[PDB]
Amino acid sequence: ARDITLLECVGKGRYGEVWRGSWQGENVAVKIFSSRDEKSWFRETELYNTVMLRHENILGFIASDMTSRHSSTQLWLITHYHEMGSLYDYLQLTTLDTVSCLRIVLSIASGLAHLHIEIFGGKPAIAHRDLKSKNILVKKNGQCCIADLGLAVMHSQSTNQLDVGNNPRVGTKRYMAPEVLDETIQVDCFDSYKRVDIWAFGLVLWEVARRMVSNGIVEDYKPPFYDVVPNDPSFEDMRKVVCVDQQRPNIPNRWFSDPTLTSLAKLMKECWYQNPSARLTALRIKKTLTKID
Amino acid sequence: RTVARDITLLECVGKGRYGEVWRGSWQGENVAVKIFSSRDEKSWFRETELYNTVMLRHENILGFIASDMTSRHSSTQLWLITHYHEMGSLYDYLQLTTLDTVSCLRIVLSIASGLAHLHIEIFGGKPAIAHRDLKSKNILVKKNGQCCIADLGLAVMHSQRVGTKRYMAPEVLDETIQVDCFDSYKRVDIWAFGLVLWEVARRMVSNGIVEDYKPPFYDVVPNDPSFEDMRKVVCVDQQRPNIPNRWFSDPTLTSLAKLMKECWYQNPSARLTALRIKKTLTKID
Ligand SMILES: COc1cc(-c2cncc(-c3ccc(C4CCN(C)CC4)cc3)c2C)cc(OC)c1OC
Ligand SMILES: COc1cc(-c2cncc(-c3ccc(C4CCN(C)CC4)cc3)c2C)cc(OC)c1OC
Ligand SMILES: COc1cc(-c2cncc(-c3ccc(C4CCN(C)CC4)cc3)c2C)cc(OC)c1OC
Ligand SMILES: COc1cc(-c2cncc(-c3ccc(C4CCN(C)CC4)cc3)c2C)cc(OC)c1OC
């Protein structure tokens, strides 16, 4: 029972398109890649070949296909479907209580620690390189899963092998770490890519915490750096604010009246050091969030 | 819209260390489905990366349809789907069939055509490609009498010891191959082409005479030769396949003997190019 029916488009952009489809009488998500992003399709396919990748907080794949007749090629990725959409979509619409806020951020930390930590026997260590709220899906149990492994990079400690792949694509400009924006990142060092993920995770923590109510107050949804860069920021716009101006997202002062938001502000600042080796690990973030409340 | 992905697997036409090849049916049409073993996973990734880079389309290259990866409970299933050629491999065909002058030339010119197409860089186009496992089992026979080259699971691309041991060039066996020079890999293919040309020419009738099908070096190495077995024959003793006297009574086989010796020089840079083999073959008969 391999057939799929495409039912409605739930996303269109430079990446291609995502469809809600029907397969074996279940909803599936079907991504059809743009020609411009063919190397992302292949990288994501290499990543999903890892059976031990599977995790409650990683988007589950069903199949990957490259199809062709004559001169045209289609590139397909079929995954589980999350009708609540991305965390970006969800935060526009909804405020959070303490329980819901911690459940979301701990689930992302759990997914990211699962990616970063090598499993021996297995799964290589994996750095994502494009973590952001559009690449996180919300599940009906109030946990999230991380999506889009097209830029990922794999490392095996046992065999001393680093696979950075071949993909000219770069991460989403708004979420790029200082060392990415100033292009000084150590490209032959696996730990460099984990540290880029931690920066981006800090930004996602900020986006989420803004939406958690405390003392009758909440902030409106805003993307990171909304106050300091143009609407559709360029690479150089982001380099200006992050590297030249040393800007970091502002902590609303109302957070300091709430113990949970005070803990989260501390945690996001430890993701944002210009010095990448100073930043927390995904495991330490997971352990910290496990303890918070 | 409905995306019909069901393929009916009808009969197994190949089983090996690589996995299995099945004749299958998609929407009424024969396809060939290669199901990869864990042993041979990297061949699916390499061929898939190549076709993701350049969608080869040539009458003498096995026609790509799809690369499929399906998640299972405890494994990943990897399928390559191509055109189906019911006559099977050249290896199979030659066991079962003698050739006349026209069929022999049509087979070898079609192989040279496929191989030159792989080897050529085309600008605007395709990268240059070396096959790295050319042999009679990796060539399929079409109903029109032409062949197509199959299995790009070891192929290497360029823009400006993985092969079958019996078909390895001397520079592969003695580890002198200039691994930094893409032309090295083209020259390894040409050596193998020359062995295939010998396998085919043996089955061409002249003056009521034909040789039995044998694989290259059948008379000097064991049924399943070691790397060392091949090195001693090809590198140390510098043996080459036997050219039977009866060929020198036939103008076509005399010309094909000359061509196969210009594929078997010890010095890789002395060997003919695929394009020069094509031109030579179009002037025979
Ligand atoms: C994978 O292989 C096979 C696929 C198909 C197949 C099925 N539906 C649609 C298509 C198709 C339609 C249209 C376009 C283009 C046309 C021009 N452009 C402006 C827009 C899009 C591309 C593709 C195909 C090719 C048929 C096959 O056999 C008949 C295949 O071979 C087994
Ligand atoms: C990020 O990356 C991938 C995501 C998905 C995916 C999986 N479930 C659900 C979705 C979704 C559904 C619906 C909406 C709503 C949002 C608000 N509303 C106004 C419009 C529609 C949003 C999102 C998606 C996009 C699949 C992918 O591959 C198949 C992804 O690529 C790896
Ligand atoms: C995913 O998997 C398999 C798919 C197929 C297959 C079946 N029907 C139709 C198609 C098709 C082709 C092309 C378009 C175009 C339409 C125009 N526009 C520019 C976007 C895209 C749409 C649909 C395909 C590709 C066959 C398979 O096996 C033979 C598949 O499994 C390997
Ligand atoms: C070398 O490589 C690949 C080859 C093929 C492939 C393509 N058409 C047809 C075939 C085939 C059909 C039928 C017979 C036999 C049946 C019994 N009878 C007594 C003689 C004939 C043999 C062979 C194959 C094996 C597909 C592949 O991948 C999908 C290959 O791998 C790239």
> Could you state, in order of their start, the residue ranges of all structural domains in chain A?
1-83, 84-293
Please tell me the distance from the alpha carbon of residue A157 to that of residue A120, in angstroms, as a whole number: 9
* Residues in chain A preceding a C-to-N separation beyond 2.5 angstroms (breaks): 121
Judged by CB atoms closer than 8 Å, whether chains meet at B55 and A66 is answered as no
Nearest by Cα to B163 from B193, B198, B130, B134 = B134
- Residue located via tokens 């329980």: A99
Containing H/E element for A140? none
CB of A165 within 6 A of ligand 2: the answer is no
- DSSP 8-state secondary structure symbol assigned to residue A236: H
Q: How far is CA A24 from the centre of its chain?
A: 29
List residues bridging with A6 in a β-sheet. A21
- Positive or negative, the Cα torsion across B225, B230, B233, B239? positive
Q: How far is CA A87 from the centre of its chain?
A: 10
B54 contact A CB<8A: no
**Resolution to one decimal, Å:** 1.3
Q: How far is CA B181 from the centre of its chain?
A: 21
Please tell me the distance from the alpha carbon of residue B31 to that of residue B22, in angstroms, as a whole number: 8
From residue B106, how far is each of B100, B103, B144, B204 by CA, in Å? 10, 5, 10, 12
Rounded CA Rg of chain A? 19
Please tell me the distance from the alpha carbon of residue A280 to that of residue A113, in angstroms, as a whole number: 11
Query: What φ, ψ does residue B143 adopt, rounded to 5°?
Result: -65, -25
- DSSP 8-state secondary structure symbol assigned to residue B212: P
Ligand 2 centroid to residue A181 C-alpha, Å: 27
- Residue located via tokens 């192929």: B155
Judged by CB atoms closer than 8 Å, whether chains meet at B1 and A6 is answered as yes
Q: How many CB atoms lie within 10 A of CB A23?
A: 19
The reply, when asked if residue A11 is annotated as ligand binding, is yes
Nearest by Cα to A80 from A146, A17, A171 = A146
Q: Which of B4, B48, B71 sits opposite A66 (nearest CB)?
A: B48
From residue B198, how far is each of A287, B103, B120, B215, B259 by CA, in Å? 68, 15, 24, 9, 10
CB of A148 within 6 A of ligand 2: the answer is yes
Q: How far is CA A181 from the centre of its chain?
A: 18
Please tell me the distance from the alpha carbon of residue B218 to that of residue B220, in angstroms, as a whole number: 6
Residues B129 and B119 sit within 8 Å (Cβ to Cβ): yes
- Residue located via tokens 């494009």: A130
Nearest by Cα to B259 from B271, B247, B268 = B271
Q: Name the residue at shortest CA distance from atom 19 of ligand 1.
A: A72
Q: How many CB atoms lie within 10 A of CB A243?
A: 20
Q: Which of B6, B66, B74 sits opposite A66 (nearest CB)?
A: B66
List residues bridging with B21 in a β-sheet. B14, B34
Query: Cα–Cα–Cα angle for B197, B202, B206, nearest 5°?
Result: 120
Nearest by Cα to A174 from A231, A91, A221 = A231
B22-51 residues touching A, CB cutoff 8 A: 41, 45, 48-49, 51
Q: How far is CA A122 from the centre of its chain?
A: 22
Rounded CA Rg of chain B? 19
Residues B153 and B46 sit within 8 Å (Cβ to Cβ): yes
- DSSP 8-state secondary structure symbol assigned to residue B233: I
Please tell me the distance from the alpha carbon of residue A142 to that of residue A102, in angstroms, as a whole number: 10
Please tell me the distance from the alpha carbon of residue B240 to that of residue B265, in angstroms, as a whole number: 10
Is B133 among the residues known to form the active site? yes
- DSSP 8-state secondary structure symbol assigned to residue A243: I
- Roughly how many angstroms between the first and final C-alpha of chain A, as a whole number? 46
Please tell me the distance from the alpha carbon of residue A37 to that of residue A51, in angstroms, as a whole number: 24
Q: Please enumerate in sequence order all residues whose Cβ is within 8 A of that of B29, keeping only pairs 6 or more positions apart, or say none.
A: none
From residue A268, how far is each of A192, A227, B240 by CA, in Å? 18, 18, 71
Angle at which helix A98-116 crosses helix A282-291, to 10 degrees, equals 150
Please tell me the distance from the alpha carbon of residue A188 to that of residue A110, in angstroms, as a whole number: 26
Residue A142 zone, left/alpha/beta (φ > 0; ψ -120 to 50; rest): left
Residues B35 and B77 sit within 8 Å (Cβ to Cβ): yes
Please tell me the distance from the alpha carbon of residue A61 to that of residue A43, in angstroms, as a whole number: 14
Judged by CB atoms closer than 8 Å, whether chains meet at B65 and A65 is answered as no
Q: Name the residue at shortest CA distance from atom 17 of ligand 4.
A: B13
Catalytic residues of A: 130
